[PDB]
Amino acid sequence: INIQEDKLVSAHDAEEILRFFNCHDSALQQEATTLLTQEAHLLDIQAYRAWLEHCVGSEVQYQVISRELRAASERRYKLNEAMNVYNENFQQLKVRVEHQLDPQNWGNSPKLRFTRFITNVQAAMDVNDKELLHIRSNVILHRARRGNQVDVFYAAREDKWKRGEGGVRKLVQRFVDYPERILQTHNLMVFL
Amino acid sequence: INIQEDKLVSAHDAEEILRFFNCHDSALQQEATTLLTQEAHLLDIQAYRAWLEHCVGSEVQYQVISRELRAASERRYKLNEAMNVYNENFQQLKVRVEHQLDPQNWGNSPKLRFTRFITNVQAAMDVNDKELLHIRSNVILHRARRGNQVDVFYAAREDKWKRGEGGVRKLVQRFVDYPERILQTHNLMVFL
């Protein structure tokens, strides 16, 4: 993509497109789909410890940002463009998991209901680290609780996955640029 | 999954995870995807008789439950945990199909519009019945009618499919535990 011509495209987005339009491997797309479907299943049934153990690498960065709305023509204002809704290492994810599992987390009674829809899976091996797998996918996440509370989240996920203990591919980076600036879901207390 | 450690996980959910983390067969996942995509297409175009004839086994149990909200710590109150929104055998599904097709079903004029999104397909053969196929999938179902009525349903489906007449795989069990306790969609008069 020529971003001087395609005026609405960011350099980052153009870079990410390039990585998937190259070596298409059908088998890798399928592996990626299985990996993400199993991850989503563990999360949906709230098996958060199993998710950590089976899906999340010790060196993980798990990051969801919220970008301040700026003018398309803006070129002078150069202060922090985004904040981190999440920016977690493994221990920080573990804290969040223990918070979910704590029997005095009053908000988790009655039990929440999660349903995740994972689509648009793309996969490509890194060029310089043949053990690093880039996976892109989109998620719709439905959270229902307390009779009539319903919150639906929508996001694109830029992941890196790498083989870890026992040869199991695990998440080493997830990056989400959350598309809604003001959340209308009470909070973002879900693992995208 | 150790459900004593993963405190939020039900025994049933842990059992279902186990069945897919075992023998992964890529070809079966693809067959399952085709089966469910074709089923959804027939339903979306309201070909309910074709759906019965091509997709639904004579011994089917088609079940959607609504579970009463109980305390996570509850251990004494032991009355009916759920009611059946659907709990249909083949003849009961046929009654519902005839009700849909009846020219005096006033609610079906003007014609409804359905769009289904099937994701997260997983498939595994039963261990003890090598002719029984377990299929898990999630559905978003969009129903539009009468200018400005829009209802969106979200669910995970635990299916069993088996080869029937002519060797065609047909649904012999569908189980849905509907995630929203109080429906905000006027009714649940859709085939999930």
Add this chain to the structure above:
Amino acid sequence: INIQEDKLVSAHDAEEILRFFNCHDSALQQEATTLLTQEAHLLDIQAYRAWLEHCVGSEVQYQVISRELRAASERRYKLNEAMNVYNENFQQLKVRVEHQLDPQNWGNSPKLRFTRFITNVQAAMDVNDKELLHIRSNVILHRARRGNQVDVFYAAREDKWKRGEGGVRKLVQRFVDYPERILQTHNLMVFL
């Protein structure tokens, strides 16, 4: 499908079912999935010129209709059944793309956010034109802007794709019969 028996099914819908229930080719389904996932990615990052160049055939008809609500029993009133929300040739799509990219399109600042979810992909080669590929897929399209505006679109897409310049498969027809009669999304200014 016998549409005299399946009373709710239109002749057009029955014709479209038939084309996919015939020669199932797994490889074609996968090619179609890649094609549509890459198309959706280009659109999501607002690479509209790249979308035109890589995804859209010079002879394209890009059509989205809105059908007037009529009685299921109606047989006499025979005036225009639908209007065209879109009915674009290549040059008309180009006009829309230039409108999106124009630096005085005030509505595009701050930058919009798009996330597309493509599901239910089916593919079949045309019988009489072995170079014509029929692809059916459903889309959920999420558009977020201006802090708290969120619009979600739902549609089934009937596409024809054909090999063009450089052997690249490109869209030569898209047909959408939009399921909601009265839009509740401010406009339909998105490429379904």
Add this chain to the structure above:
Amino acid sequence: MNYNNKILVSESGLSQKHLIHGDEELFQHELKTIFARNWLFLTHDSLIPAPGDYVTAKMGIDEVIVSRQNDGSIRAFLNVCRHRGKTLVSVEAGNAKGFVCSYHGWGFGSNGELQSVPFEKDLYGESLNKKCLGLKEVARVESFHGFIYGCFDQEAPPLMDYLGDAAWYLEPMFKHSGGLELVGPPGKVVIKANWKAPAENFVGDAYHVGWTHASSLRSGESIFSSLAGNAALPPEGAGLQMTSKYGSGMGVLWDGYSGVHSADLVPELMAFGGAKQERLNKEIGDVRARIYRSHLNCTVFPNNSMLTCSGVFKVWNPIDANTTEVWTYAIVEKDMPEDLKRRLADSVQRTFGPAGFWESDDNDNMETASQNGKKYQSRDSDLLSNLGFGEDVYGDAVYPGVVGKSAIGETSYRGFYRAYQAHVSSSNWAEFEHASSTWHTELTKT
């Protein structure tokens, strides 16, 4: 709007202003004059049978905790903490000796008493008067054969008197059958209708059945199936309609014990009901034994409805003028075989539950009729309920109440709306009584 003077329901209940289904100010007024004043359905003994068992329920727009006490009685309390007003209980049912607030940890007993306050000694010393800090209690809680109702107004008539002439019709099934059980949990669905739309439909609308439910009648093969598409009118003597002083009313369709249940349950039910009827002839007489196995479509004023024999039990919980949360339970006879109770419960939900195909037939009728009440040109229009007027009787030797001796009519609409108007225009029970001292005469004019 001046509710003292405004004629929302005309003389004899013959018509109602369409605005009653849409006006939000009137809805707010109903919270006071209808829901805070009258008896509202809470639960059944069968859902809270043991000490400590509780459920949550709506009473109008308020939520209450309904709890079985150690002494076997039932008390109900606002589901609201007495400290800073947080919702105490977030589940629908359970068993507990108390309820602890998740905000600052105040602990209330099943009896509503404030029993504990974290660090009370160090924080409040002896200054907190916990005796005055009990949960706000529902003043009146009474039972009709296991069916538990509540009322916020201490001045209300006893539940039995409030049922008035309707009680006679309910007793064969509610009492003489050996008793009923409510099968939970209920289905719960929001519809975009005023609570009065389904309430009026269940209280007295047999006219709609053949046409509204044409497709369900034709498809399900139930016992009332000859009505499909108005293909046939029920014969003379097929049933009757009744209404009462405090607004409750019902239709009676003779012998229709299998109700809306599809053909798969008809033979079993018709045998069971007939067998019990033969026993009841000797105990309560032929007429009342027949009523036992006859289909009753009833509303217990204001917003609890049921179809006996079909076993459908409904609460139309008000949210706003065009929003109602529908709770659907099944009723079964205690001495039915357990397998029959299970199938009957599933069939109630199959026909009238969240995916009830019969109930779905009613959606557009009730939603549009309600929403039209907001439309400018319809607000001051008159909804008609004059069918059968001038043919009702009172004080009949056999059938009590204001009675229309025909299966199809609007007798029960008229009694429902007469009571509704008397409440809306009154400030208390004494005023309702004064406004109702010639209730049956008004209903039987001409």
Add this chain to the structure above:
Amino acid sequence: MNYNNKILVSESGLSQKHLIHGDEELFQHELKTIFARNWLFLTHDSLIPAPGDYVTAKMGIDEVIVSRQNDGSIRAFLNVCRHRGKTLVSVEAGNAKGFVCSYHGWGFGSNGELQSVPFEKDLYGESLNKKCLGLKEVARVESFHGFIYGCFDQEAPPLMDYLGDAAWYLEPMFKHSGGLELVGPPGKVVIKANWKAPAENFVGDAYHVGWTHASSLRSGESIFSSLAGNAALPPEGAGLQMTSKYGSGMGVLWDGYSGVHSADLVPELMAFGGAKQERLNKEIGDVRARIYRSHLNCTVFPNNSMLTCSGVFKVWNPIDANTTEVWTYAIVEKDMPEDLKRRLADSVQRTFGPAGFWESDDNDNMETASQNGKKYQSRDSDLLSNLGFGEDVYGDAVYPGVVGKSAIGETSYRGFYRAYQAHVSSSNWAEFEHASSTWHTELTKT
């Protein structure tokens, strides 16, 4: 708010309180004083040409059935059953001799009469007076060259008089062109704006075009394209503005017959319009023949707008103070080749339909301007419409109405809001007339 006294629109229409776009109490008041009083667009002959043809339409927040009678006339009725108020018709168009209610099966004729009641003899006997149970009829239904308008108020002026001075400008295209057809079905989209925001924009806002529509002008290559980004001001004599007693008004852009249509239609249209103009010179004179092929942006008070030549036809159906349901049709000249009509219709929707790229440019302008009317610090602020004030004339020898002889100004805003204020502060047509007896003098001050 006291609508008799409250100055919502200042003298000469020079400004309006911003609250008019946000205040829900005023919206409710408009239902009475604007929508129940004035002429509202229903349909066109071309959409219901044959006996039995019908469409549904909104009139304010009410819905009506608009039906072609056997005698060739058109009658319109509230889409509400006279029994218990259910919505009668659930489709947008069709052909029928009658409408049967899906609740209890009452059957109404295309003429609104209650023709049948299921089992009438057995249920009502001879007691039901069906003659008094006809659908509530729209009192006034009139045509302007095939364009059908309705009014609930029997006291309204005839449609032709109501159009006042605007009729003269519309006639060359509506009448002398041989007649127009409305191409349906319309696009339908909800926007979060007050109905007055697009109404005021179409009635008299040429100022916004170059800036608001900069991207559409630059991208589409239409005939008005030199305006893009305010790169150029239209020359003197490029057009004019007009307004009238009953609030209707328009801008006139000389010769702009291809309107907003992209370059792909420009040569064909400019040839067609020019050829018909040459014929019309001899029939209606040069000036009026020129007006025929000139672009008119018009609002027919209160909420029907159009762009002639572009062929855009709009209804801004009110839902609440910040919600409007936009209906978009195409208008075509009857004697255009069919292939041209088809492409013109698609182009109307391409530019101004649900995915109309021009219409999209207006979204934020109209939504935020409307929503700001709810904001505390803006409610009592003044929206300005003073551009061109002191330069308008009345009674011109050539161009009738209150006229500003310039292409860009706010003349038509002032006339629109003068009529709006006169209606809002009046209880009936007689009071509006009294409040309007010096309408043109007020508009031409200074």
Add this chain to the structure above:
Amino acid sequence: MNYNNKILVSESGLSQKHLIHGDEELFQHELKTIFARNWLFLTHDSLIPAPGDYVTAKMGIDEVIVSRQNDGSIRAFLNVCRHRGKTLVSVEAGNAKGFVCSYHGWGFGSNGELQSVPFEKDLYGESLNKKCLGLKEVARVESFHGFIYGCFDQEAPPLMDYLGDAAWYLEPMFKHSGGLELVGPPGKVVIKANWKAPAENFVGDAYHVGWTHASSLRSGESIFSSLAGNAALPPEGAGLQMTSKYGSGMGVLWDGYSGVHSADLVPELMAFGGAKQERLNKEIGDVRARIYRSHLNCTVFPNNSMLTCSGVFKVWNPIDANTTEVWTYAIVEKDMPEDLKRRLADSVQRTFGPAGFWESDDNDNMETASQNGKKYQSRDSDLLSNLGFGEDVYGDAVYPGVVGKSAIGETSYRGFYRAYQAHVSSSNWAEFEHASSTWHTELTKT
């Protein structure tokens, strides 16, 4: 409701009617008597440091543009075009010398002046008085150590006086630390609570911490972690509570400099704060140096809250009685190492941001407490804030304000609601002052 007479808050602030969290008419009244009258948080110097830098902010339900002027001052203006009321700025932050309206292209300066109007000469001539068409300006804009507040009421006290006795407590961290920076952009989330629910919680609710935040305390390992599940009460002398004339108040937890930050930041923070405290002893005395490194939970009346040391900074932007838009920033000390500032900012969002696990613990408490205020049986009920009443002092030799010398109590609720009631029942600042002339005496009774 008559706000002059209605007792919404009882004497000494001991209780409040639950309706205050739900009543929409009162919410509308608050727009006038609370939000249009009092000081509201806008931004920080650190977010608009250079000439031309601007941000948008809410002030009540209004939106303003807050702009750094060329002279180094800050001015704020309604984000509403003076022509026809369109929203001027659609972004959250940037740098510009002016703002051009996308409707008709009017151009306003960073100083609010109407600087340009497209084609002014040809359209308006010399008739447009641009001097009178500047953006509606926020009358009062003042700074407290870089923190910028605005007030629509010219009659308000200076910001410093308005902070009253609370300023003394804030100064060690806000001033004597060398100064704070606000790290943007903020998280933004809508919750279904009244703005007063989180405002009251931050101003004076230490009681809830051990129970509400039991899971976050247990899981995060922060310094206040011994409180988890009410396992332990803070010792005597662990802290105090204060409140002030104009409603601002806070809790003080001695020495808690690492606040809610998880164990991963505790050693680093406790070293940093302790080191600065040792320097400050010599400058401002031991007590005030200790306050610097003590955890303050504060609300600056009405709707700005913070946790110093934790670094949480909140705006509870009102939308309606049960809707609030929560803005969450991080505060950091300027002279902290940059890497520490970055980690501190992430930790603020980790704990109290959109996915803040601590903040999530509060959701149900605040939403249900607010929504219950709409429920019929709860509207007239009394929310209690009597903990510690009769033990507060005023005029203490060491700690100024109305002070409760205990870590846990409701002192700050009482002062918050005393000021709230005085404003709600007053028409202007002079009336508030008259209603507050014995403010501390009322709070220290018994």
